[PDB]
Design a protein around this ligand. Sequence first.
Ligand SMILES: O=C(O)C1CCN([C@H]2[C@H](O)[C@H](n3ccc(=O)[nH]c3=O)O[C@@H]2CO)CC1
Ligand SMILES: O=C(O)C1CCN([C@H]2[C@H](O)[C@H](n3ccc(=O)[nH]c3=O)O[C@@H]2CO)CC1
Length: 124
Amino acid sequence: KETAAAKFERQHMDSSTSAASSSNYCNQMMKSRNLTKDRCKPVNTFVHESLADVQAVCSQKNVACKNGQTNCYQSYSTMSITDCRETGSSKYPNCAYKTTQANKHIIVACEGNPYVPVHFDASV
Ligand SMILES: O=C(O)C1CCN([C@H]2[C@H](O)[C@H](n3ccc(=O)[nH]c3=O)O[C@@H]2CO)CC1
Ligand SMILES: O=C(O)C1CCN([C@H]2[C@H](O)[C@H](n3ccc(=O)[nH]c3=O)O[C@@H]2CO)CC1
């Protein structure tokens, strides 16, 4: 049974590439990470940094979560990320995404012992 930490890794971690997102990156990644299974997940961010680096964010800048909770953290440094955003023409089950590479600070929610990322809140 998938832990929240494991789900975060599946939904949000892609340490395999430096950028290097083809115009096709999101189409393929959203499907393979199972984010197009029950619906087209409309927005999803993949982070191209080491797991250690992203986990480290849980001890970085404490910031308010969008939901009003206090357990969110913003990375001190910008991180390589790919924003995946459903296109206007996209229709389930043929989910289609615009791929946008950027370098931005990430904000994640962390929980548990060990204290680890469980939710992607924002990129700024
Ligand atoms: O993976 C991503 O990049 C995105 C995944 C979806 N989102 C949603 C998420 O629900 C987040 N949000 C908003 C309100 C809230 O109470 N909690 C949230 O996580 O803000 C985005 C839309 O307002 C952020 C980032
Ligand atoms: O089983 C558990 O212990 C946990 C399973 C996962 N979670 C949620 C929790 O809401 C946490 N979360 C989510 C959104 C948010 O804004 N803040 C969070 O802490 O992320 C997990 C997956 O969404 C808490 C409980």
